[PDB]
Design a protein around this ligand. Structure first.
Ligand SMILES: *[C@]1(C(=O)O)C[C@@H](c2ccccc2F)n2ncc(C(=O)Nc3ccccc3F)c2N1
Ligand SMILES: *[C@]1(C(=O)O)C[C@@H](c2ccccc2F)n2ncc(C(=O)Nc3ccccc3F)c2N1
Lengths: 301, 302
């Protein structure tokens, strides 16, 4: 029993973290096979980040203008390229600790573990959700760029995120491992608007099932609802619309608890309209939306 | 910016997790040098846990009755001994992945990372606080016993906790790495009272400092208090009394934010007496106490 925000064991990813330096700038890199991936803004100086011309800046750089360090040992760059917003520094030696890996571009509402790093060294690990507005609510300080997000499937590491910036509003933005930003963000020191964020409805319902499995049932009510009627309330409270796909994804949790998905929706409608009235669910005074149905199943089983 | 419950990277601990089987019972073990550490209840059957005589049960066990497996590598058990509530199985080979380590008995209020494991395989990592009543609020299922809690200092792993049981109340109990339980708990399937739990006051104040560093300052007030005055409110609200030692440990955060500790105490007093009025602090509608002043410094600067 007990329900916790749980990150994946980070060992397979720790062995891939390197320090990347280009002039005065030092950030983190991911060494997989003979390639080191890192944010391309590593090639920018203070007077460049307002509107950098990355193609021009990268031309002024040579393979030897990048110092890559894995622990104490220095790696040698034999070819540099730019793929969207990521720099790919090809090194002469393959990382012997390269795990079985995949690059995946996750969907909003999905979760992953962040291995926060500083100077190529892992500092901590925590679980994040990709918000519906494509930002993440992380914990990042200067030097944390190049830190990655990932999921594990048995022995396969699926890398899905690379940290690129903290927006002026304190929220975090980054790319997939092909350098494509999640959301409308760009790699420049400019005020950028994140969309209106919404609550991940299917994740709140999954967490309500996690609470039922762990003994917290006070919120289960005599009322019920329809999918279209529930969405009327959800739209008022800035919750993302619930589809039949979301109901289907919730099927295994519904079966384990004996609680119909629409009945759990009925309980959630009353929690939104009437609030929690100073009560807690799984140790929280707010409705939690950063656990997917898969996160609940794998933690409870 | 941002504030999160952050665990230590678990790689150095993953290389130490093994599977330990004794008859039908399988749980996790910790392999450091040529010793495998695990809960002594591994030698019990379902109908032994009511009141086991561990010394008598262990006498019926020989080295070959313990099957120890690190991945697919089978370890050969050449010695066995019981130290308090842990079994120490001597194996014929040193773990090549043994990191630099220490065994520590943490104090109540201190935090640590838990690497939850099943069948000797790691499944997740999360941070826990050793509650003032010596329980932890974790996430453990059947098969999780033998999972460890730890802290990392540079390259050194300080193992502080081994999981042994979930009480009927749903909370978790275990030992340090010398097999001494935290709290009054025993390793038997019996109803056991965890005392009244109290809130770690120094940790709540540290998190209020973390909130101010992150821009959350609505709760800051034009009031001040004294140590004894604050403590009359802390005793009313089941918060542990604040001492000058806690004040001193908060020193760095007070210096960084420019907010005196007794002034932060006055804000906490107003929050205890008036609630949060439906507002949030660092993404929470509750006062948080599972972050120490060290956890705040490591994250807010580091
Ligand atoms: C990242 C790096 O490590 O190089 C760090 C990251 C950052 C900075 C400060 C606090 C947290 C945090 F995650 N970061 N944000 C922005 C940038 C950057 O290179 N440029 C920049 C500056 C200001 C606003 C937007 C922007 F893109 C970095 N660098
Ligand atoms: C642990 C093991 O893996 O052997 C598992 C742990 C447990 C059980 C169920 C849910 C969560 C959880 F952490 N556990 N709790 C108790 C015990 C045990 O061996 N005996 C027992 C049973 C009930 C209460 C106390 C008690 F000691 C285990 N074993």
């Amino acid at each position: 029993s007990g329900f916790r925000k749980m990150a994946f064991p980070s060992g397979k990813v720790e062995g891939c973290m390197v320090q990347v330096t280009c002039g005065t700038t030092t950030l983190n890199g991911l060494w997989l096979d003979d390639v080191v991936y890192c944010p391309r803004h590593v090639i920018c100086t203070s007077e460049d980040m307002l509107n950098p011309n990355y193609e021009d800046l990268l031309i002024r750089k040579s393979n030897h203008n990048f110092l890559v360090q894995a622990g104490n040992v220095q790696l040698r760059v034999i070819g540099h390229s730019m793929q969207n917003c990521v720099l790919k520094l090809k090194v002469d030696t393959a990382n012997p600790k390269t795990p079985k890996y995949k690059f995946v571009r996750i969907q909003p509402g999905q979760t992953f573990s962040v291995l926060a790093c500083y100077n190529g060294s892992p500092s901590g690990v925590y679980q994040c959700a990709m918000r519906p507005n494509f930002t993440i609510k992380g914990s990042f300080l200067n030097g944390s760029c190049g830190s990655v997000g990932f999921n594990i499937d048995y022995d396969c590491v699926s890398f899905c995120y690379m940290h690129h910036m903290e927006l002026p509003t304190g929220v975090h933005a980054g790319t997939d491992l092909e350098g494509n930003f999640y959301g409308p963000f760009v790699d420049r020191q400019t005020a950028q608007a994140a969309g209106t964020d919404t609550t991940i409805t299917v994740n709140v319902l999954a967490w309500l099932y996690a609470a039922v499995i762990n003994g917290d049932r006070w919120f289960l009510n005599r009322f019920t609802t329809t999918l279209n009627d529930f969405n009327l309330v959800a739209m008022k409270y800035n919750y993302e619309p619930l589809t039949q796909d979301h109901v289907d994804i919730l099927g295994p949790l519904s079966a384990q608890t004996g609680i119909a998905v629409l009945d759990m929706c009925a309980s959630l409608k009353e929690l939104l309209q009437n609030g929690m009235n100073g009560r807690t669910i799984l140790g929280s005074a707010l409705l939690e939306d950063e656990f997917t149905p898969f996160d609940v199943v794998r933690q409870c089983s």
